[PDB]
Design an enzyme around this catalytic site. Sequence first.
Site, PDB file in Angstrom:
ATOM      1  N   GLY A 244       1.136  -1.261   2.713  1.00 14.69           N
ATOM      2  CA  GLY A 244      -0.305  -1.316   2.604  1.00 14.69           C
ATOM      3  C   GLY A 244      -0.828  -2.555   1.920  1.00 14.69           C
ATOM      4  N   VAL A 245      -2.145  -2.696   1.985  1.00 10.47           N
ATOM      5  CA  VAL A 245      -2.835  -3.744   1.255  1.00 10.47           C
ATOM      6  C   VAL A 245      -2.992  -3.271  -0.212  1.00 10.47           C
ATOM      7  CG1 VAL A 245      -3.988  -4.242   3.471  1.00 10.47           C
ATOM      8  CG2 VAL A 245      -5.321  -3.067   1.694  1.00 10.47           C
ATOM      9  N   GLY A 246      -2.602  -4.126  -1.167  1.00 10.04           N
ATOM     10  CA  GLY A 246      -2.711  -3.809  -2.588  1.00 10.04           C
ATOM     11  C   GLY A 246      -1.587  -4.379  -3.454  1.00 10.04           C
TER      12      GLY A 246
ATOM     13  N   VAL B  41       0.510  -2.423  -5.705  1.00 11.31           N
ATOM     14  CA  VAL B  41       1.676  -1.551  -5.817  1.00 11.31           C
ATOM     15  C   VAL B  41       2.636  -1.985  -4.696  1.00 11.31           C
ATOM     16  CG1 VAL B  41       2.360   0.798  -6.316  1.00 11.31           C
ATOM     17  CG2 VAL B  41      -0.021   0.196  -6.456  1.00 11.31           C
TER      18      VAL B  41
ATOM     19  N   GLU C 161       0.440  -4.099   9.250  1.00 10.03           N
ATOM     20  CA  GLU C 161      -0.806  -4.774   9.532  1.00 10.03           C
ATOM     21  C   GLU C 161      -0.798  -6.174   9.021  1.00 10.03           C
ATOM     22  OE1 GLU C 161      -3.978  -2.961   7.527  1.00 10.03           O
ATOM     23  OE2 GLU C 161      -3.962  -1.147   8.730  1.00 10.03           O
TER      24      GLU C 161
ATOM     25  N   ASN D  47     -13.240  -0.155  -0.317  1.00  8.31           N
ATOM     26  CA  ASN D  47     -13.004  -1.060   0.799  1.00  8.31           C
ATOM     27  C   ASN D  47     -13.191  -0.393   2.156  1.00  8.31           C
ATOM     28  OD1 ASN D  47     -12.337  -3.124  -1.060  1.00  8.31           O
ATOM     29  ND2 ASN D  47     -10.187  -2.472  -1.072  1.00  8.31           N
TER      30      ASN D  47
ATOM     31  N   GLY E 277      -6.176   0.685   8.092  1.00  9.19           N
ATOM     32  CA  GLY E 277      -5.147   1.251   8.948  1.00  9.19           C
ATOM     33  C   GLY E 277      -4.304   2.341   8.294  1.00  9.19           C
TER      34      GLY E 277
ATOM     35  N   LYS F 132      -8.926   3.040 -14.886  1.00  2.00           N
ATOM     36  CA  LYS F 132      -9.936   2.727 -15.894  1.00  2.00           C
ATOM     37  C   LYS F 132      -9.420   2.998 -17.293  1.00  2.00           C
ATOM     38  CE  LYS F 132     -13.059   1.857 -12.777  1.00  2.00           C
ATOM     39  NZ  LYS F 132     -13.167   0.389 -12.593  1.00  2.00           N
TER      40      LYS F 132
END
Lengths: 511, 504
Positions: B268-270, B272, B293, B383, B387, B407
């Site tokens: 994934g995007v990020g 982690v 992706e 966001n 996908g 947070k």
Amino acid sequence: TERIRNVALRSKVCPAETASELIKHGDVVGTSGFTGAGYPKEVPKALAQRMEAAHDRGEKYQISLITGASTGPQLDGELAKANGVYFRSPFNTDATMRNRINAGETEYFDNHLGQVAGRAVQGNYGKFNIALVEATAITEDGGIVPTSSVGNSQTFLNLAEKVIIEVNEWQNPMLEGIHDIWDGNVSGVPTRDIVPIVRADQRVGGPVLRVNPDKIAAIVRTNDRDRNAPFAAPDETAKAIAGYLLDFFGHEVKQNRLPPSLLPLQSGVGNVANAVLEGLKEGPFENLVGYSEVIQDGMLAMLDSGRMRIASASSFSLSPEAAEEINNRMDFFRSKIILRQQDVSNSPGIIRRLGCIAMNGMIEADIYGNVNSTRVMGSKMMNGIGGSGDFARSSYLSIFLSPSTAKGGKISAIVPMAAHVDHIMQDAQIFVTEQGLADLRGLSPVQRAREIISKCAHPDYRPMLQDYFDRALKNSFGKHTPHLLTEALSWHQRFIDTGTMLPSSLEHHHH
Amino acid sequence: TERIRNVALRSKVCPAETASELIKHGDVVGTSGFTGAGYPKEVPKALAQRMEAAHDRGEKYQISLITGASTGPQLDGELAKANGVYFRSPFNTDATMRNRINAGETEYFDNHLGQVAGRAVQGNYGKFNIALVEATAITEDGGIVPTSSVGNSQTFLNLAEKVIIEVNEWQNPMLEGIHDIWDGNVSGVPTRDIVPIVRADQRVGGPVLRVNPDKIAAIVRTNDRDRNAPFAAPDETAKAIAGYLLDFFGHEVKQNRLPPSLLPLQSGVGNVANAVLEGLKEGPFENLVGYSEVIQDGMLAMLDSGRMRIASASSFSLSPEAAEEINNRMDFFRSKIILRQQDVSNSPGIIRRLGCIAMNGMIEADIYGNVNSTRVMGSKMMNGIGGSGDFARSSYLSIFLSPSTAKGGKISAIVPMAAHVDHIMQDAQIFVTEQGLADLRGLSPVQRAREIISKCAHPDYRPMLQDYFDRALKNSFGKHTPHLLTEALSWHQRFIDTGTMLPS
Ligand SMILES: [Cl-]
Ligand SMILES: [Cl-]
Ligand SMILES: [Cl-]
Ligand SMILES: [Cl-]
């Protein structure tokens, strides 16, 4: 005529009671059975009996029961009555089993129907001890001819350590040839095979389930009926819903966004589906095609008139009248129907390629068009997600259809927030109730809410919905999907406490 | 060396300002751009300025902006500032655009990224007036070579009435060759074609986007940079998460539930992800394959250390350091990477067939393992779903990963009930936090709860989750998926009211 045409397997014939002894406490049992059709009948009844007898003496006796989809009184019913099932998957419609599930006496997980075979092979349900499968016949080379459904039977046969077959003389011998069973890698270890289906009438396999005869531990001769649910005659609410849907189809055709023959159709069962199938039979369409989970009364009628040219499904779901009709004409209807493994009927690759139109029921939707198909008040199971997810997400068009109210007006089927979500906004484009039709294509959540409230919500609830929405827009943490978390789920709690979502006028309500 | 190699198309070169004038109030504009890579830059800026001017004179001037996925300040940023986008789809990460969306000033719908092309062809966004596409070059035959992403560009070019091409000299000319654009009907009128991809490294198409040159109304020479991912490394929380996942994969292989080379990986995007990829870079799993992706920093490194053999994606999302690295060695990396149309990279049929392992981030999950990917407090867009749905539902194994808190400990990432659902229980099998890993396969919802609460929840919040669950089991309307509706969303409201989910 002799239904077991393989002479060697005749030596494995024995009584139901004895066959049921093969099934031990703790066993994972995979069975045939899909929308009330083609489930084993006699071995489960004998099993339930021995379970109850064990329990009465303080002895544990429960199984894990993995099916195609729903079964019927002789299987789910008898076993839930005996309290004999510790885990159940993936879909149930029996009321006794539903009570076990909702009391925490049977553990339940409603997997997407098209994924069940795959997850079974991956080992998610554990090791399969028993496959228990109903058959029309056994062929000369030991092929197993299924009955009124295919479901997951081929996967259960592959995985199970021992196999029990029920050969049911009640099932019409001319079902043989109606099934299409593929030996390709649909739900096995990657890389999987391309399932090369490019039309709804295409056969890719053969007529029999395959199993090593050395795994067959018992064959039981049976003679008992499927669960043929009474025909649910459309009421005016169902007819209104169908009217709006058929008006919509007619409009899409006239705007060239659908051919005159529409696209392969997937529908459910019950009141509304019956009204839609009746409307399709009479409408300005032609050369229709079904690519669904189930064949229902209305489909047969269209296959008879020639309005539908072919219907693909994993199962039959017929009224007694319709069952009688197809039984007396199995020669004609066998040429019009293909019954597939449910991991092919519910394959997202195929559903998308074919461009199916998905039409499914729902418990409720919220104003943003998130859909709940399963869990009343978010915690009480109805049936299960079934293949609604398989089809809703993969379809060319995803249509959800429901009365705008439930329980005699005391529940609104359009709510501030769904108490549980099965289908996210992105998986639902069209909503139809007896109040009208909301076309949500290309809309943001706030725009969806304006359409759903104005077109679909019942007039008794629309001002409360509009008030919730108006105040959310003024006060929500963000304004992209406005909510008031203090009252989002308050209509449901109101129902839990008082039996209705309608507020009392003895207290204040902003609308 | 001239980027526009079709001599005749050179007569269509004009100024970015003049090009922007082709775009009219109310137009639907499809653009290139995916994960901050390959979006048009100069025409959007010129447009933004004309939009502000028009608004001041009392002239409405807004567009619908349909992209591959996220873009950057020159596009989403400038048009947001000008208040010039009435509707946006499918995925945004620009802060200014996000603020327009959460203020209700831009309508947004975050479609599954693999479905956007199909819905656009269906007419869901309306008629495309304009396709605005960034190119590395224009071949002699009039083919449009993409830049750092493919996205939905082929489809927008097909649909749009007029085409504007930005030819960006900033983009590396050696990107030419890296893309695979398929001729077939992936997202058009049914019945669609079978996409014959059976291996992640299989090319089935060609290097260029195809467009009728009579549709090209303007070509704008540009020179401006993509966005970069930050250069910032995995902390102890992300590394803990990667450690548990890698141990899990190890156990799976040992039990023979995964091959020793695992299965094609979607990361994934990020951030982690970076920890996870950095973990795999020196992990015991060799001959890895990406089918994702995006090409992140992590993936580039493995492609370097031979630990990963090939990566399929639709786009690049690289730090400036990684960008510099690939632009020095494009001839090496180009043979290791395939960039595909997003309706192919995110095709559920393909993803299932290849048996992808999906690894995605999340805002929060509830105790039953429903996942929120998008909407904080249920209402504020972050966001978009992107996908994550395409891959979660299609994958062989669907994994979600997250810090157990957000947070600074004032939010729990495990809640009684998700304030919004993107991924249903059926679409999430494995959860990993820095507290441990929950394996939910084969489990009922109450069984899922026990795993998620005990393995994944932060110790500050775990007794509170257990308290909710135990009282729900006693008092819930049904017991299949126990809830107390009077407090299911009370932690979120408590955060809104007090700034923390912890009681006083
Ligand atoms: Cl396929
Ligand atoms: Cl849409
Ligand atoms: Cl395909
Ligand atoms: Cl599972």
